[PDB]
């Protein structure tokens, strides 16, 4: 997710030496992993139920 | 007079952070006089004999 940036004030005289200055964007990340590993067990006694 | 001009050019740059234009005007020349030509000067005051 990339978020909004911040506003700076106009400054012509300060723009002389800061034309090539950098400003990293506001980016955030989130990670999701596997959680559930289960099973269901049942028995069927064919002859005993027949 | 032996005056010549070698370079006459103009360059422009733009600052995107301060919103202004810089103009440079370059002039390169050669300035000299010829000793083979007649040249007399009229002087008033104390001048040397030779």
From Swiss-Prot, chain B:
Compartments, as annotated in UniProt: Virion
Domain of life the protein comes from: Viruses
Similarity comment: family membership: Belongs to the phi29likevirus major capsid protein family.
Functional summary from the UniProt entry: Assembles to form a prolate capsid shell of about 54 nm in length and 45 nm in width, with a T=3, Q=5 symmetry.
Subunit structure: Homohexamer. Homopentamer. The prolate capsid is composed of pentamers and hexamers of the capsid protein.
Name of the protein this chain belongs to: Major capsid protein
Protein's organism: Bacillus phage phi29
Species lineage: Viruses, Duplodnaviria, Heunggongvirae, Uroviricota, Caudoviricetes
Full-protein interval shown: 300 to 349 of 448
């Amino acid at each position: 997710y990339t978020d909004i940036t911040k506003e700076k004030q106009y400054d012509a005289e300060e723009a002389e030496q800061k034309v090539f200055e950098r400003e990293m964007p506001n980016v955030k990340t989130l990670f999701h992993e596997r959680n559930r590993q289960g099973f269901y067990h049942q028995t069927i006694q064919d002859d005993s139920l027949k | 007079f032996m005056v010549y001009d070698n370079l006459h050019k103009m360059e422009t740059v733009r600052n995107p952070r301060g919103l202004y234009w810089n103009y440079y005007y370059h002039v390169w020349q050669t300035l000299s006089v010829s000793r083979f030509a007649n040249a007399v000067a009229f002087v008033s005051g104390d001048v040397p004999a030779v």
